[PDB]
Amino acid sequence: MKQGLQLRLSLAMTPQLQQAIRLLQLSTLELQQELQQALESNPLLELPVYQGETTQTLQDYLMWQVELTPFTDTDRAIATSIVDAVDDTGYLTIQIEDIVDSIGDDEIGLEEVEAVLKRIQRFDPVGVAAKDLRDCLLIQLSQFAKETPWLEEARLIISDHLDLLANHDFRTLMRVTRLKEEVLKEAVNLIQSLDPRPGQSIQTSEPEYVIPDVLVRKVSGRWTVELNADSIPRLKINQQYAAMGNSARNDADGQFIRSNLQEARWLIKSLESRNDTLLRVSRCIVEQQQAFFEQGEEYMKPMVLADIAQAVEMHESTISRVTTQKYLHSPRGIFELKYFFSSHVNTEGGGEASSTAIRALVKKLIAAENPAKPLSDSKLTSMLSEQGIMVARRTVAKYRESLSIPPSNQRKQLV
Amino acid sequence: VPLDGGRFATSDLNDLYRRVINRNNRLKRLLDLAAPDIIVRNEKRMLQEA
Amino acid sequence: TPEEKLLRAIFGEKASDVKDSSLRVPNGVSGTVIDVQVFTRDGVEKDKRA
Amino acid sequence: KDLLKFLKAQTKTEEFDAIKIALASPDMIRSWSFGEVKKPETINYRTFKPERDGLFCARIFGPVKDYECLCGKYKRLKHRGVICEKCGVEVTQTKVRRERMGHIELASPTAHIWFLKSLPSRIGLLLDMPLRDIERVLYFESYVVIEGGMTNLERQQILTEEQYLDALEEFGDEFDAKMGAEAIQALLKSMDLEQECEQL
Amino acid sequence: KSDDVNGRTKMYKNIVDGNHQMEPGMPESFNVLLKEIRSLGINIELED
DNA sequence: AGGGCTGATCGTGCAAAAGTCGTGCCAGCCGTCT
DNA sequence: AGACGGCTGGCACGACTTTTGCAATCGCAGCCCT
Secondary structure, eight states: OOOOOOOSOOOOOOOHHHHHHHHOSSOSHHHHHHHHHHHHHOTTBOOOSOOOOOOOTTTHHHHHHHHHSOOOHHHHHHHHHHHHSOOSSSSOSSOHHHHHHHHOOSSOOHHHHHHHHHHHHHHSSSOOOOOSHHHHHHHHHHHSOSOOTTHHHHHHHHHHOHHHHHTTOHHHHHHHHTOOTTTHHHHHHHHHSSOSSGGGGGOOOOOOOOOOOEEEEEETTEEEEEEOTTTSOOOOBOHHHHHHHHTOSSHHHHHHHHHHHHHHHHHHHHHHHHHHHHHHHHHHHHHHHHHHHHTOSTTOOOOOHHHHHHHSSSOHHHHHHHSSSOEEEOSSOEEEGGGSOOOEEEOTTSOEEEHHHHHHHHHHHHHSSOSSSOOOHHHHHHHHHTTOOOOOSHHHHHHHHHTTOOOHHHHOOOO | OOSSSSOOOOOSSHHHHHHHHHHHHHHHHHHTTTOOHHHHHHHHHHHHHO | OHHHHHHHHHTOSOTTOOOOOOOOOOTTOOOOOOOOOOOOOTTOOOOSOO | OOSSSHHHHHSOOOOOOSOEEEEOOHHHHHHHOSOBOOBOOOBOTTTOOBOBSBTTOBSSSOOOSSSSOSSSOSOSTTOSSOBOSSSOOBOOOSGGGGSOOOBOOOSSOOOOTTTTTSSSOHHHHHHTOOHHHHHHHTTTSSOBBOOOSSSSOOSSOBOOHHHHHHHHHHHOTTSOBOOSHHHHHHHHHSSOSHHHHHHO | OOSOHHHHHHHHHHHHTTOOOOOOOOOHHHHHHHHHHHHTTEEEEOOO
């Protein structure tokens, strides 16, 4: 306004201490390791008994079958080598030639290795070590009874018509195999129930860990959030060390204690401020993401980093630092902090939509479709434009790739 | 021996090794920094009792 | 994963996405179910037949 | 490896008669161990993988559940004893994890609680010192004298903090004394056995 | 009937083959005992 | 006897170049109907 | 049986993101060089 100079009264270059403090808040579990590392340097800052029960582990069964089955010593070694080349799904990871090379025996021939592999295939109750989907299907068909509807047709299709089934080219398969129309569907359905990856049944393991860091939930009609008390690290100044340093007879020892106390106080203040800033940022993010929190992913507001930065006094750089490897648990579930931010899509009615919400709606529409006639990407684009997509189906194509949606030709199948 | 699945929470064998390891690390790091005799002696006594 | 992609194009709807963690009766127990109950936390409304 | 004797080599045991017992030596402890732990971390919840240089860590205690190396490369039975470069891990069975003990350096000296605490004081009967003196000097609050014959002081006598400071004040840097386990270690290493045996 | 890992499989093989023959091995619990004693500053080993 | 000058102490950002996506747009191709 | 079509994938471009690389000016005074 009016030109003038300073007529009444009213910034900082953060050094390595505050600089590393800013470099902090990148993670939480990793932050604990660095905090322990600093606390090591800083001296003024502070039967029925459950034991593991062995399991088959999808390989001890194979070893037990090998031991029980009668095999030669060389045959036993080859069987052990084959068991080494195993997968959780149940297919042989390494090639037969690879097994022969690893054997390192002039005698070791491909015929003996093949005989051992064939014996092992029928050895375990679950058909395994097929190393080929066609081989596994053939093993399943052989195990299946001879008196089956279109069993020979299904075997012929599995033999060399795997590609036709892969592309769902039913017309091409019917033309090539000269199979019966609308009757080969029975053979296809029978082939569908062939237990692919049979070994995976013996494999079972789950994480059962989320390690939550924040807790936000609806209460009294409003979303309330709080940092996880257990997860947040805490530091305490060593009172005994502070007392010793204050009354230290040696001047040098007292000065060193004072320097250590200053460093520890700076670190503690930085940690507390980082935690508080993260809490405030999470509260601000929730204030605007309550719609997605309550209604679901479809009601996700298109939000950017600057949008969150505007509601707070911190910069977008602080927003990025806060939105770094942070996971928050809520009634909906566990989600990353960065998952909140989404692209803005122009839409009918003037509003902008979150690209994540658009992809979720697209997936919901695609799943709820007639299996006989799969929706075209152009058709899906028109359907979303009926809701105001303002998209050219290239972004829809990218979203479908993100969701691994198959082609309209591929999605279609026999009814 | 995981109890909750999320946290294994070893006890009676590993908390002791954890204490000894961290205390020895702090003493070894501190001994190289020409610490005052009182603090290093107290840390050594902590290590011995651990 | 070309093998897994081929399997999914053939069978699909499993894609080895889920492992069987179904609740099965331990051996040596035979009986008749009297009744089941389900408790769902607030915020989730799946309620398929709850 | 012919792969026909390697499997036969694992399942073997000795005659194993005449079991003995003796005190252990630091060199034997070093020979027993393969690596040294340095971090209190045991397992990571970010990847559920063995830590680095700590409890349950790789490059010590042996491999992980399979012949697969922790880095991810060299994962097959074709490799029998090779050690990868990005990760130092012997490609073997998992059972060996129950047969590899670790070691920690522990730069500061430390006494062994099984000794000097049972009914007979091994340190006490070795040094002819009362137990009270040995536990008082074991905790940095007794300041026993180590040596010094020029001064009018006994070889093995208790000199409290005030006593130690004044003794160093008048006698100068001659009455050497220590307050930790290294004091006991020095007093015990710097003594003959046959001469005292003959005297007794 | 015990911790002997190399004995259980061998005896199962002999029984299913109808051999009824015994191979002793050495218990794993004694190995645990040795490892636990060696954890203390006490050397213990097996002679010949 | 007078000048040089020496090291203590200090400090929640940002911006600038780089990257990187959202969206659209073009080229080809194969299933197909002609 | 050569062309329609929808897919898919490569290509490009402004518009959101973000990360690292900086580490200012300040009053004491006694000691060393001239």
